[PDB]
Amino acid sequence: TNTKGKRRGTRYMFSRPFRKHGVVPLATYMRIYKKGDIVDIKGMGTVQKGMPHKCYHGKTGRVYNVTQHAVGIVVNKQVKGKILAKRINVRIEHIKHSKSRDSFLKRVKENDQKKKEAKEKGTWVQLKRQPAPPREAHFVRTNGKEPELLEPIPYEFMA
Amino acid sequence: VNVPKTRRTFCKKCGKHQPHKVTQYKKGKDSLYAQGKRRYDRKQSGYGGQTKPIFRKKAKTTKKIVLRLECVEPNCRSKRMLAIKRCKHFELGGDKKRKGQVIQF
Amino acid sequence: AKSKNHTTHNQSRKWHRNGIKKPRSQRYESLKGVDPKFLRNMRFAKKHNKKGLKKMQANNA
Amino acid sequence: GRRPARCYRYCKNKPYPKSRFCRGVPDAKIRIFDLGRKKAKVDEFPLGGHMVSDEYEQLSSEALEAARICANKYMVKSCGRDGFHMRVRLHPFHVIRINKMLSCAGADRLQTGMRGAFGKPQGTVARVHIGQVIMSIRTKLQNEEHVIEALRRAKFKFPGRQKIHISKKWGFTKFNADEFEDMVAKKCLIPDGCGVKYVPSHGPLDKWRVLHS
RNA sequence: GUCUACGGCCAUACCACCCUGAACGCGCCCGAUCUCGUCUGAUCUCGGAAGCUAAGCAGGGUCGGGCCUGGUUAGUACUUGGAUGGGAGACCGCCUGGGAAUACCGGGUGCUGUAGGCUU
RNA sequence: CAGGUGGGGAGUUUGACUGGGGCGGUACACCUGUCAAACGGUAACGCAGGUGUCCUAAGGCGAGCUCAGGGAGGACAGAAACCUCCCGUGGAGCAGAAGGGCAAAAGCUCGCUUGAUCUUGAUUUUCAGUACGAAUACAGACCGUGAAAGCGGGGCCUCACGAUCCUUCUGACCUUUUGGGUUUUAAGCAGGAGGUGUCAGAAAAGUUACCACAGGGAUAACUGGCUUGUGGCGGCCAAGCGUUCAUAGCGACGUCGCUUUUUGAUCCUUCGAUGUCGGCUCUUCCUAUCAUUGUGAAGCAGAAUUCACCAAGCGUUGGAUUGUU
RNA sequence: CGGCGGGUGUUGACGCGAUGUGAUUUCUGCCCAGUGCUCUGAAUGUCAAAGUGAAGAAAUUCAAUGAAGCGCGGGUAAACGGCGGGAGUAACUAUGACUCUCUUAAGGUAGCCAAAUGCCUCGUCAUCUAAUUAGUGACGCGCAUGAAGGAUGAACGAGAUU
RNA sequence: ACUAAUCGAACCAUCUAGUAGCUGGUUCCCUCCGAAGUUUCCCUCAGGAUAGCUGGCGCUCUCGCAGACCCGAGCCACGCAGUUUUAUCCGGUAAAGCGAAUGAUUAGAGGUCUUGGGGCCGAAACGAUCUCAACCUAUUCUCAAACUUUAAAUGGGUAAGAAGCCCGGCUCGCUGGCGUGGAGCCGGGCGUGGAAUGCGAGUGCCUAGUGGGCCACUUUUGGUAAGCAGAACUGGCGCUGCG
RNA sequence: GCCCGGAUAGCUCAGCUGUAGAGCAUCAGACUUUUAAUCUGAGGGUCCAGGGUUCAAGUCCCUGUUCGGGCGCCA
RNA sequence: GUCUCCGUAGUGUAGGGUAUCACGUUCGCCUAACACGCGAAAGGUCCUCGGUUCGAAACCGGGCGGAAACA
Numbered sequence A: 001t002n003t004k005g006k007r008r009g010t011r012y013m014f015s016r017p018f019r020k021h022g023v024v025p026l027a028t029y030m031r032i033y034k035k036g037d038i039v040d041i042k043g044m045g046t047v048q049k050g051m052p053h054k055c056y057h058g059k060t061g062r063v064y065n066v067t068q069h070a071v072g073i074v075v076n077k078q079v080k081g082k083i084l085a086k087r088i089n090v091r092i093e094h095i096k097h098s099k100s101r102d103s104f105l106k107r108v109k110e111n112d113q114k115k116k117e118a119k120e121k122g123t124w125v126q127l128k129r130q131p132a133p134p135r136e137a138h139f140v141r142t143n144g145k146e147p148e149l150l151e152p153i154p155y156e157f158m159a
Numbered sequence B: 001v002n003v004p005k006t007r008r009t010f011c012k013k014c015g016k017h018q019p020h021k022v023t024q025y026k027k028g029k030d031s032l033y034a035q036g037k038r039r040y041d042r043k044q045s046g047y048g049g050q051t052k053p054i055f056r057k058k059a060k061t062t063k064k065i066v067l068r069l070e071c072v073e074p075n076c077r078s079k080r081m082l083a084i085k086r087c088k089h090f091e092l093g094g095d096k097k098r099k100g101q102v103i104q105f
Numbered sequence C: 001a002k003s004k005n006h007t008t009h010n011q012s013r014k015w016h017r018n019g020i021k022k023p024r025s026q027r028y029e030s031l032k033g034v035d036p037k038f039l040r041n042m043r044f045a046k047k048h049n050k051k052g053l054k055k056m057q058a059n060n061a
Numbered sequence D: 001g002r003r004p005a006r007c008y009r010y011c012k013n014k015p016y017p018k019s020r021f022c023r024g025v026p027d028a029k030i031r032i033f034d035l036g037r038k039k040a041k042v043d044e045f046p047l048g049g050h051m052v053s054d055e056y057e058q059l060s061s062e063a064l065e066a067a068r069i070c071a072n073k074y075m076v077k078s079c080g081r082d083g084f085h086m087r088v089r090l091h092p093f094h095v096i097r098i099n100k101m102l103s104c105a106g107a108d109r110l111q112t113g114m115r116g117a118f119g120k121p122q123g124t125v126a127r128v129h130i131g132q133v134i135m136s137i138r139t140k141l142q143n144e145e146h147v148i149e150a151l152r153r154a155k156f157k158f159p160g161r162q163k164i165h166i167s168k169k170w171g172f173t174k175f176n177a178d179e180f181e182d183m184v185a186k187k188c189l190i191p192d193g194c195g196v197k198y199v200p201s202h203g204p205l206d207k208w209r210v211l212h213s
Numbered sequence E: 001g002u003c004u005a006c007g008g009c010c011a012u013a014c015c016a017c018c019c020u021g022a023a024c025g026c027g028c029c030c031g032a033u034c035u036c037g038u039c040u041g042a043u044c045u046c047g048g049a050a051g052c053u054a055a056g057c058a059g060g061g062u063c064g065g066g067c068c069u070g071g072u073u074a075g076u077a078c079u080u081g082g083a084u085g086g087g088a089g090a091c092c093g094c095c096u097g098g099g100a101a102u103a104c105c106g107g108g109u110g111c112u113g114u115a116g117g118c119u120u
Numbered sequence F: 001c002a003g004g005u006g007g008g009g010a011g012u013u014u015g016a017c018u019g020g021g022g023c024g025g026u027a028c029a030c031c032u033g034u035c036a037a038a039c040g041g042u043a044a045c046g047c048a049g050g051u052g053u054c055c056u057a058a059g060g061c062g063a064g065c066u067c068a069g070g071g072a073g074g075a076c077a078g079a080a081a082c083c084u085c086c087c088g089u090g091g092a093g094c095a096g097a098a099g100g101g102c103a104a105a106a107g108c109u110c111g112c113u114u115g116a117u118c119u120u121g122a123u124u125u126u127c128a129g130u131a132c133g134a135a136u137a138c139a140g141a142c143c144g145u146g147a148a149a150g151c152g153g154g155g156c157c158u159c160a161c162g163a164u165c166c167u168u169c170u171g172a173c174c175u176u177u178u179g180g181g182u183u184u185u186a187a188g189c190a191g192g193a194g195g196u197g198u199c200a201g202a203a204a205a206g207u208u209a210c211c212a213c214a215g216g217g218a219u220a221a222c223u224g225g226c227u228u229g230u231g232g233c234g235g236c237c238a239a240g241c242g243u244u245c246a247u248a249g250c251g252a253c254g255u256c257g258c259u260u261u262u263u264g265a266u267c268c269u270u271c272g273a274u275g276u277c278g279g280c281u282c283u284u285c286c287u288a289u290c291a292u293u294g295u296g297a298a299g300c301a302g303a304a305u306u307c308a309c310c311a312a313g314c315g316u317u318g319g320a321u322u323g324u325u
Numbered sequence G: 001c002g003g004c005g006g007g008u009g010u011u012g013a014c015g016c017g018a019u020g021u022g023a024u025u026u027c028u029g030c031c032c033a034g035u036g037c038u039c040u041g042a043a044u045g046u047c048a049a050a051g052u053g054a055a056g057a058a059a060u061u062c063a064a065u066g067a068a069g070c071g072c073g074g075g076u077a078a079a080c081g082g083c084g085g086g087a088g089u090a091a092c093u094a095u096g097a098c099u100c101u102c103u104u105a106a107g108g109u110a111g112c113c114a115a116a117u118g119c120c121u122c123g124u125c126a127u128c129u130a131a132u133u134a135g136u137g138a139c140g141c142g143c144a145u146g147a148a149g150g151a152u153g154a155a156c157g158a159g160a161u162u
Numbered sequence H: 001a002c003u004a005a006u007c008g009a010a011c012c013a014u015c016u017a018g019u020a021g022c023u024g025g026u027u028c029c030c031u032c033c034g035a036a037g038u039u040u041c042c043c044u045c046a047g048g049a050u051a052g053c054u055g056g057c058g059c060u061c062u063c064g065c066a067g068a069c070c071c072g073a074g075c076c077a078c079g080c081a082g083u084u085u086u087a088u089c090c091g092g093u094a095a096a097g098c099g100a101a102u103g104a105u106u107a108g109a110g111g112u113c114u115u116g117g118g119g120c121c122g123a124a125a126c127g128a129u130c131u132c133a134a135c136c137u138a139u140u141c142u143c144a145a146a147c148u149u150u151a152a153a154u155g156g157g158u159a160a161g162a163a164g165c166c167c168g169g170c171u172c173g174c175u176g177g178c179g180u181g182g183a184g185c186c187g188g189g190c191g192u193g194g195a196a197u198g199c200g201a202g203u204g205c206c207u208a209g210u211g212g213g214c215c216a217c218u219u220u221u222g223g224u225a226a227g228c229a230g231a232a233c234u235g236g237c238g239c240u241g242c243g
Numbered sequence I: 001g002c003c004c005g006g007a008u009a010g011c012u013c014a015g016c017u018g019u020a021g022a023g024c025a026u027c028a029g030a031c032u033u034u035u036a037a038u039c040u041g042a043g044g045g046u047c048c049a050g051g052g053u054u055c056a057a058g059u060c061c062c063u064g065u066u067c068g069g070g071c072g073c074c075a
Numbered sequence J: 001g002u003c004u005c006c007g008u009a010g011u012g013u014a015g016g017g018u019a020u021c022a023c024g025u026u027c028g029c030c031u032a033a034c035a036c037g038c039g040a041a042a043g044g045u046c047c048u049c050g051g052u053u054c055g056a057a058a059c060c061g062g063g064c065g066g067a068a069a070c071a
């Protein structure tokens, strides 16, 4: 019984944030998108041209094509029991760079620097990051103070 | 809707934008020697009654209006069919509208 | 007379019985759908890429 | 021609206010929510008694009107017509519906059963929570037993369980009676109307100098 | 320490009132022959340089409003998973993890890029 | 041979969904908000609504302005006529339903225009990742506007629509038209249109109690079962009635129950059949007791009566009318 | 099926053929707008084939002419059928003898009735009974009576009722 | 009505083994694998087609196979995941709010204007100023599936390397102030194989049955409710015995 | 779809490219001693709208609006 | 039980910009007196409550009373 309209249920999805209406800031247009970089599809509603469909809002994809005003993005879409890679043309107002890739690139650059330093000197270093290990043994000083005795409080009917 | 009797638009034969005279396309009469009409007449001859469906279930109230364009260049009388959306009332070259006017009593 | 209209019950189990496989990623993604002007210039660059082979080999040497 | 309240006792539906989608709503039975000397100042009536619900349920507007009338009559009898101020802290904003069925011997004569079952508005109820105040009475400190008895009588007009509480707040304000008088003395509270205005130590100094003068 | 031109983020920048502004500048200001626009040289366009910081603008101030950021609210509300837990129910408690928002109370009140000026 | 008449006769059809079917409605093709449980998807004859249009501008550029409302003034003039100032984050307008979006905008007023044009592919939406429809980003022409950057291939976005076959029109000094040639004609190739609203698209009126068949407890009419709105019978509070006095006897406003002796709701059993109203006859059971036994209370003097308790042992009738209960 | 074939017909309007109503008595009202039926064409609208004229090289196209029928116009209700409203109006109110109108054409006449026809309804009144949703008699704005069928009336009935 | 016990169209033979989306039946054993009642379209709703779920047949690869007996002699598989972790985005539900917008809504208080009623003696300048209204201001009670500043828990996407990183060089008709930008290509060097856990993966063909479901916790819509009707999530029954 | 017809004071009907009329309605006068009846006068044209042939048009020609006839019917 | 319609001088009544007619009543004209006729006056807080706008009998919402149609 649900309509198949392209923008059904997007009432808050494409609405602007509070006190952030009006002119689109120009750094969004000044961003540079190459082929192969990773972008988050947001989908603001001030620009009605080149809008992504609501199923791609909040998704992340890789740029494969660059045009005058838009980019082509290869974004995964799960359709029932299969995930298929869809190519979508999105104007640059509705996308932004993804920092998930950038954090990994920083880690790679630091890893290569550390490996070069280790090979230069001769000291081995742990390169793989590890899950949070169990806390080691330590001493807790009382500083000449008895720890404060805590007790549950009596019940009272506030209102 | 109201469309003007002339418009400047692309001419396929001229290969460029040219002035065009605009009329309304009207369906021509049936040939009686078109192959489908011949087949229908042969099928209907004899006994058996009606042999093809007769629609009689109309639902649309309008038609898509087709404009017959004609290039006005004397060496190029090339014609074209432009279809516009469905309209109940269509006028060719009617009087244009004005904004700052009163409603007549 | 009347029947059940729609459900997605058991559909998730059906989808996961053979696994929800991601698309098969591989090197050299296809060039279809890319800007025709950029694509025809890439074809020209590939065609004329042969010339300068001597310069490239000398620099490599 | 009203159904028993056992049919609409529980908050089963989402809130259904009277709005531009719900038209044709009969007016609620209760139209008056404040009684007694509403014009009494904040210092006249320092004692506040509350009726608190232990049930997450719906109270009908008719039940609210009946409880209000009962408590008002008892308070008038035991404390005079100007010895108290009563406030019903619940408003019947939730509309309940009825799927009207033809109550005669006949079914083919357009009874239709459950087809098109959505009902017409019937009445309004007040959706109440556990620990929510239903009714409040403020009065002098010597009328505490009368307030308790009035709320005890009013408890019999309601479906669920209710507690009678004596609030530690001063009257109908949100400030404790322990600190209220000294706050008023140090001008942290200004008595206006039946309540008080809290005066923070921020804003223009002109509003501070109209005080202390 | 500031300003001008173009800006980035787009209130910590906004709003109300008051005070101060040296030098450049920015402006107010003078005029309508030409350019150009008007019901109106008010606006716009043009040609200027007598006067002025009165205004704009800049800086500051206000137990200022707002905004921004903390505390409290509060491990509260809500919530993932669990039980042959309680209760006639309504609902509630516990285990296992996560965890807010007002009111109220503090602090702050634009940062900065490019290019070019002024300030002994 | 042609036209008319022609249920005298022939053949056939007489949609679907559906808290049974019919009547009603369209939940049958679509669009907005909600449902919907903070990705997306999600149902009911769920809720509030809308659609089968309108627009040569309400399309495309560019420029200039600021809207609703309010305050204070100004001859007639008043709550509303116009003029002026000030405030005014949009509280207006953008064709329509709603939602989103929008301020030297996307609104209003002008100037010029026809990108609402000619083309090939790719993609998104429903999706089976088919089609239509709608849409997005390009590319190649030819243009419009603007000083220009640019913007524009319809409407700010979400809807406003349609296969095969057939017909009609337009285009290529195009192909074929059958032994060859010319010319009509006809066929074709490409793109518009004439439509299927049951909207992936048959050409379609009833009746049957004279009826038939294949089936269906997937589905109604009678029992039973769940429920108890409605019906019936109780309880709690006690404003009041009771000359006085809440509670001898009653009980408004509220509120809690029980029963399945009413009627509904549902459709679980039964459609290779459970004989369907009432009466007659006959037995048994229940108690929420009309009478009788023993009792308590009274606004119980007696008599009569009323309320309540243990209590179903025993009884509860003869007739007129009506098929009747 | 067919033959100038056959039935009525060995017949001829006091006859054949087709209908409705249903003895006697007494009446059989208004409506020809609708649908039928029928009648005259009065110029006359539409209208096939054939035929005629023109264009064309021909296929073909166009035009003119206009049979029946329909349409137009008369008649027809013992043809099918139909017989509602509204406004004003009499000296108590109330009704409307009277005057106009609307949908079409006419507005239910004489009669009859809670009838085998009336829902409401077990209508109201009288009678019949101790008691009658029954019967009879009467009334009649009659959901939804009614005139080739209405209203009667002896005799008759394995007809229905008291 | 009757027409040979047959009549709302007799009887006999034939077409004829008429058609049936509907009912009934459908014949030996063991072993292995093992469902669906959902999507889209259909004069479709007791049926099909289609995708999904199933089976069979494979094929392409990965790990090594170890020692005649005995006896390893930083570094340890292609790749995958209904899982967590580390980063990074997405959201508008629960809650909360209304002295924040839009709607709804209770009560006082303080004010000065008005087409408020009017108002005790004021036409006279209500000489006066008492009251009720409306309005404004600061407060106040109660709210929202189709309201919202704020805003969870659970959840959705991406990344966590050799297809990576870094150096040079060549091509371009695209772009262009420029040795410009971008893309492609060619060489070279980097291995501590750059979270945890587990598991061998990839790929093709043919394909049956199903397309009536039902139940439970929790979320949830209509309904007074229902062993009612309709959805979401997971599990189950159906297909399953056992305590 | 083709061939035809009509469209007006409040209501109805006739009408000449050279100046729209008649009746019924309204109002006011006339006749009568008076009321009716009767005679007159005044106002009233959704001339169905638009463009044109037109010096002139309600008229004639085309385009729509409904009201209607007779035909005709393969998406 | 629901749907539709209506709640206005005593009565029936029509009806955003301060309520019309007739009867009922009274009075005044006219007559020698009467009847009639003519004219004037009185008489409806518009069912009740709430709401929007300058202002509501009219428009909107709720609730009462009455009459047809369903049920």
Ligand SMILES: [Mg+2]
Binding pocket: none
């Ligand atoms: Mg667009």
Ligand SMILES: [Mg+2]
Binding pocket: C003, C004
């Ligand atoms: Mg099904």
Ligand SMILES: [Mg+2]
Binding pocket: D012, D013, D014, H221
């Ligand atoms: Mg519910």
Ligand SMILES: [Mg+2]
Binding pocket: none
């Ligand atoms: Mg501040």
Ligand SMILES: [Mg+2]
Binding pocket: none
């Ligand atoms: Mg917890």
Ligand SMILES: [Mg+2]
Binding pocket: F007
């Ligand atoms: Mg027949």
Ligand SMILES: [Mg+2]
Binding pocket: none
């Ligand atoms: Mg979700």
Ligand SMILES: [Mg+2]
Binding pocket: none
């Ligand atoms: Mg969602």
Ligand SMILES: [Mg+2]
Binding pocket: none
């Ligand atoms: Mg502009």
Ligand SMILES: [Mg+2]
Binding pocket: none
């Ligand atoms: Mg282009």
Ligand SMILES: [Mg+2]
Binding pocket: none
């Ligand atoms: Mg279909």
Ligand SMILES: [Mg+2]
Binding pocket: F217, F267
């Ligand atoms: Mg069943």
Ligand SMILES: [Mg+2]
Binding pocket: none
């Ligand atoms: Mg009951």
Ligand SMILES: [Mg+2]
Binding pocket: none
């Ligand atoms: Mg008493």
Ligand SMILES: [Mg+2]
Binding pocket: none
């Ligand atoms: Mg069922």
Ligand SMILES: [Mg+2]
Binding pocket: none
């Ligand atoms: Mg039997």
